[PDB]
Amino acid sequence: VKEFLAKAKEDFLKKWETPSQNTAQLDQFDRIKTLGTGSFGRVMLVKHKESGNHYAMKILDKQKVVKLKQIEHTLNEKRILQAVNFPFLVKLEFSFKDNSNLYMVMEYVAGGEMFSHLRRIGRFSEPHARFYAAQIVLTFEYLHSLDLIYRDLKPENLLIDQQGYIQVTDFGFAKRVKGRTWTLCGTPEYLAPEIILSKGYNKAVDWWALGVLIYEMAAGYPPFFADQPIQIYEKIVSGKVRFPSHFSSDLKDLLRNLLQVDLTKRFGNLKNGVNDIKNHKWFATTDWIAIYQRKVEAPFIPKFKGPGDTSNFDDYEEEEIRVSINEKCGKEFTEF
């Protein structure tokens, strides 16, 4: 692994230092349907004219981003996404901008969000949850080795590809930092107590989030839930966690070490780092190399009928892409 990570780092640094820009333009794509909406725009299924390939186009409104002080995060998102390379990370195919918007064209993951499958099915069996978890563990090991913190782990950001494997999307809060950071960002149910407490935090928050993810996948509901975020935060900081009766002893033990408020005890943040997790009894049957190579038997393969199929995604209200005749926020997004 150390050998692999060292090379991955070199590759990453080259792109981080000299990012690619303007690798396509708007008229090269026919917009089909919205796959999801966000605070600064939306993600749409699109078809690239010349190739006929389908992609997911994330659209960001510049003025909006600037008004809401999210410039740095947006720049982080694209700079990082274009530089990473891993089997479980969605690939950024093209990127460009125009008078009004920023565009990030990713490979299209037709299988839909893990979220929809999870809610529909109710909960995943342990081996099924474990299959997904192993993938996130290897992804975090990779990202962390590059001084990157993901910051938004949740089923809604995890897509299932045609092989039944995970493709992580939404690097909106990804950031390259050595040491601690302070931004209050993420998704309520997945926030680690140190984030909520405004005390400064590090990569350890991704490991706590993994804990929440594993718990949600296996239980069918989050360990800390309520009607309002504020109520959720109180539960998270209290630390009290209760496990469903069906949880194995191993799962509960792993979870108690991930959903650990004490930073000196949280798995993934100790002397042995990721190895404390990889070597845990819950992952005993996990063949890490096989997982990385995508050779393990996927527990579930989404039904897909032809490219361009969006049957695995909910429907959203369509809207017209507006492109002003005047350039908006040009200086702010020069590097994009």
Partner: peptide, 20 residues
């Protein structure tokens, strides 16, 4: 049950991220 309480709660749908 906990499941029933979650299912009747207002946060069972897609969750949006927060910032700042």
């Amino acid at each position: 049950t906990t499941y029933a309480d979650f299912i009747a709660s207002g946060r069972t749908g897609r969750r949006a991220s927060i910032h700042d």
